[PDB]
Each structure stands twice: as C-alpha cells, then as structure tokens.
Q: What sequence folds into this?
C-alpha cells in the first residue's frame, strides 16, 4: 500500500501532463486557424497588399503545433508504459490481499 | 465651445473614410472604415460589416429619392458597393477595375 | 582620445591603451543595440497582430507572447519612428570605435568596414567581439 501508491501517482501525473499538453494544443490550433483565415481573406482579395509578415506568424504557429503534437505523442507512450506497470502492480496487490 | 457629446470607439478609424447617414430612415448613424477591411456602424452599439477588403472610399446619401433612407457606399480599389443597412440588401455591387480613390 | 589627438594635432599645426577598454565599451553598447533590434522585431508584427485583434475579441487564442505586444503596441510604434536614427548612430559609433582602436596600433583598416556592417546586420555579440579582437 505504499510502493503501490507511487505508481498510481506517476500514472496520474502523466495523465495531468497529457491534459495540459492537449489544452495547449487547442490554443495553438485556434491561432493557426485564425491566421489561416486571415491569409485566405488576403488570397480571395483582388488588390495586392503586403503580407505584413502573416506568413511568419503562420510558420511560427505551425512549428508550435508540430512540437506540441510530438509532445502529446510521447506523453501517450509514457502513459501507456505507466499503465502497464500499474496493471502489474495492482495484480500483485490483489494477490497479496487475497493471501 | 463645449463638446455637446463625447464617446470612445475602440476601433481605429481610417482617416478619409467617415460618413453620417440615417440608415434607419430617420435614425442617423456613423459609418467608418477600420483595419482589416471592416466598416463599423455606430447607431446612436457598434456593428461590423465584413468588406473583407481594403476600403478606400466611404460616403452615405440618398441614391433613390423614392424612399427616405441613406445608402452606405463603400469603395475599393477594384469594387464599389451600395448598401441598404436597414434591410441588408445590395443596391448595386459594381466592379470598376479602375479603382475607387 | 582619438578625436582629442586629431583635433589637438590640428590646433598645433595651426599655431596608452587598456586592452580591456574595448570590451567595456562593447558591453556598454550591447543593451542599446539589443533594445533597437527588439523594437524592430516587435513593430514588424504589431500590425499583423492588430489585424487579428479586430476579430473574435481575443478571448482564448492569442499567444501570451504577442499578447504582451498587443497592449504596448502604441509605445512600440511611436519609438519605431525614432529607432532608425539611433540605429545609424550606433553603427557609426561602433565603426569609428573599431577603426580608431586599430588606428592606435599603427594600422589602416578602413577596408574591413563592410564585413563589420554585415556582422551588425547579424549582431552576434560574441562573434562581434571576436571580429574586434581578431581583425
């Protein structure tokens, strides 16, 4: 009941980190969509105009989105490993309670 | 004198693009260009109109004297649009190709 | 001291170095050039971000980084008007410092200026001091 709780806490820390990463990815995606709509509006327009470095903001946001996606993937893998190890631990704990 | 009224509108007004027009027929309102190619309307709340295109002219007047409404005009370097803000309906959306300076 | 030497020699015709001083002057200059470059970098994106500001009221999407610029956009824009004079003055002062500190040793390095101009367009402060000490 004490070396068993630390695995639970590791699992839950990974879960919380995943939720944070996902709520950050949400904001990054919203930024990307907004800048993309601005660029589409500039495209549909006939008259020429400076891009005002909107493409640079788009590139920055795209880099942020890719970084966050890779982070979420790695967190998913870590969470899966932690879940398997926790399954083994709780197997042992049920065994030791049934004995 | 003294300013008989004052107010603060959160939108940057493009310099030469301002008009006053009774868009409700008897209720005068303010039409003024803004950044991003949007034209705002102050009724006495601010209402946005997506021109989605860099405005270059703006006025308001009586275009058909049969009715008593002011028509909001919006010029762009390749377009020209009359707008009946009350019953939102294009009076005419002409494409100039010479510009609206 | 270079200006004093030249002007006093001129008046006469009419009628030592601490090897770390350059480091001190460059450390003095560095904050000013850093501030000018950050000024330029922020005012480049001010208007692009303002185009996004007019829609969706900025409730949930704008990054905090550029949100720090959306407020002080006014001061940034009004300092950008005076920036280019300060940048040109700083470039001139740096090139005079370089030319003079090589002139005291008896050399004439009026030719390596364009490389210094390119370095300042890049402005790697450590590469800057390296170019100062080496050539």
A:
């Amino acid at each position: 009941l004490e070396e068993y709780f630390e695995l639970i806490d590791h699992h839950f820390e990974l879960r919380i980190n995943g939720e944070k990463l996902e709520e950050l990815l949400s904001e990054r995606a919203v930024q990307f969509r907004a800048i993309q709509r601005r660029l589409l509006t500039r495209f549909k327009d006939k008259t020429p105009a400076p891009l005002q470095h909107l493409d640079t903001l788009l590139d920055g946001t795209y880099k942020q989105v890719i970084a966050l996606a890779d982070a979420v993937e790695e967190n998913q893998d870590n969470l899966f490993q932690s879940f398997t190890r926790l399954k083994s631990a709780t197997h042992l704990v049920i065994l030791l309670i049934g004995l | 004198l003294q300013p008989v009224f004052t107010l603060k509108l959160r939108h940057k007004i493009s310099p030469r693009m301002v008009a006053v027009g009774r868009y409700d027929g008897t209720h005068p309102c303010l039409a003024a260009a803004t950044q991003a190619g949007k034209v705002f309307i102050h009724n006495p709340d601010v209402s946005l109109l997506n021109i989605n295109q860099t405005v270059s002219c703006l006025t308001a007047g009586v275009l058909n004297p049969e009715l008593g409404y002011d028509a909001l005009l919006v010029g762009t370097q390749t377009n020209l649009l009359a707008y009946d803000v009350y019953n939102n309906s294009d009076l005419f959306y002409r494409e100039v190709a010479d510009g609206a300076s | 001291i270079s200006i004093l030497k030249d002007v006093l020699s001129k008046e006469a015709t009419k009628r030592e170095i601490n090897e770390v001083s350059v480091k001190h002057t460059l450390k003095l200059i560095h904050p000013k050039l850093e501030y000018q470059l950050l000024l330029a970098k922020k005012v480049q994106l001010i208007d692009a971000l303002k185009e996004l500001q007019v829609h969706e009221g900025n409730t949930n999407f704008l990054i905090p980084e550029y949100r720090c610029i959306l407020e002080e956009a006014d001061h940034l824009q009004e300092e950008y008007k005076k920036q280019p004079a300060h940048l040109e003055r700083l470039y001139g002062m740096i090139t005079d410092l370089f030319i003079d500190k090589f002139k005291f040793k008896g050399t004439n390095v009026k030719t390596k200026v364009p490389l210094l101009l390119e370095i300042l367009d890049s402005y790697d402060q450590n590469a800057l001091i390296a170019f100062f000490d080496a050539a």
Notes: Chain C touches chain B through five residues (CB under 8 Å). DSSP finds six helices and no strands in chain C. The radius of gyration of chain C is 21 Å. The CA atoms of residues 50 and 70 of chain C lie 7 Å apart.
